[PDB]
From Swiss-Prot:
It comes from the Viruses. This is Endolysin. Induction: Expressed late in the viral replication. Changing T26E: Complete loss of activity at neutral pH; covalently bound substrate. Pfam families: Phage_lysozyme (PF00959). Optimum pH is 7.3. Substrate binds at L32, F104, S117, N132. It comes from Enterobacteria phage T4. Changing S117F: 10-fold decrease in enzymatic activity.
Length: 162
């Protein structure tokens, strides 16, 4: 298992523009196009992102491409964030993937706000971090996915994904 497979399971794959769990226009493997309620804006962002007149539909290779760019960027965002980096550097590989998953979902900014949990992760207090992480809008809005990431941080295994 790896970050790519993990996220492909959490986000799924859709080749036509859809609305995500927050009602925002997205495409491919959880690639957010826009927070605007205009399908046109969405289509415009899509064209711009792929580099062609898409008409709201893309190919699988196209989706994979956005996915790679997006994973790459999440990592880079982590490495550039003063709050995130130290945590990521302290973690094992399985656990790093869970952090990446959260940043991909909520952005660097969002995750950087989980101060208490971040501290607990840094300290390697697995159970305590899991409990704190669960006290969040994130958990309450997407509990199944949140449960999987949380278990992942708790166990340092891919169990939640097999
Ligand atoms: Cl892009
Ligand atoms: Cl969920």
């Amino acid at each position: 298992m790896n970050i790519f497979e993990m996220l492909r399971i959490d986000e799924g794959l859709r080749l036509k523009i859809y609305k995500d769990t927050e009602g925002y226009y997205t495409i491919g493997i959880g690639h957010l196009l826009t927070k605007s309620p205009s399908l046109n804006a969405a289509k415009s962002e899509l064209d711009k992102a792929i580099g062609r007149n898409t008409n709201g539909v893309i190919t699988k290779d196209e989706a994979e491409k956005l996915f790679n760019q997006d994973v790459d960027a999440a990592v880079r965002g982590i490495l550039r964030n003063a709050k995130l980096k130290p945590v990521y550097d302290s973690l094992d590989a399985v656990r790093r993937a869970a952090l990446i998953n959260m940043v991909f979902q909520m952005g660097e900014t969002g995750v950087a706000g989980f101060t208490n949990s971040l501290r607990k992760l840094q300290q390697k207090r697995w159970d305590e971090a899991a409990v704190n992480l669960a006290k969040s809008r994130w958990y309450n809005q997407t509990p199944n996915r949140a449960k999987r990431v949380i278990t992942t941080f708790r166990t340092g295994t891919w169990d939640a994904y097999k």
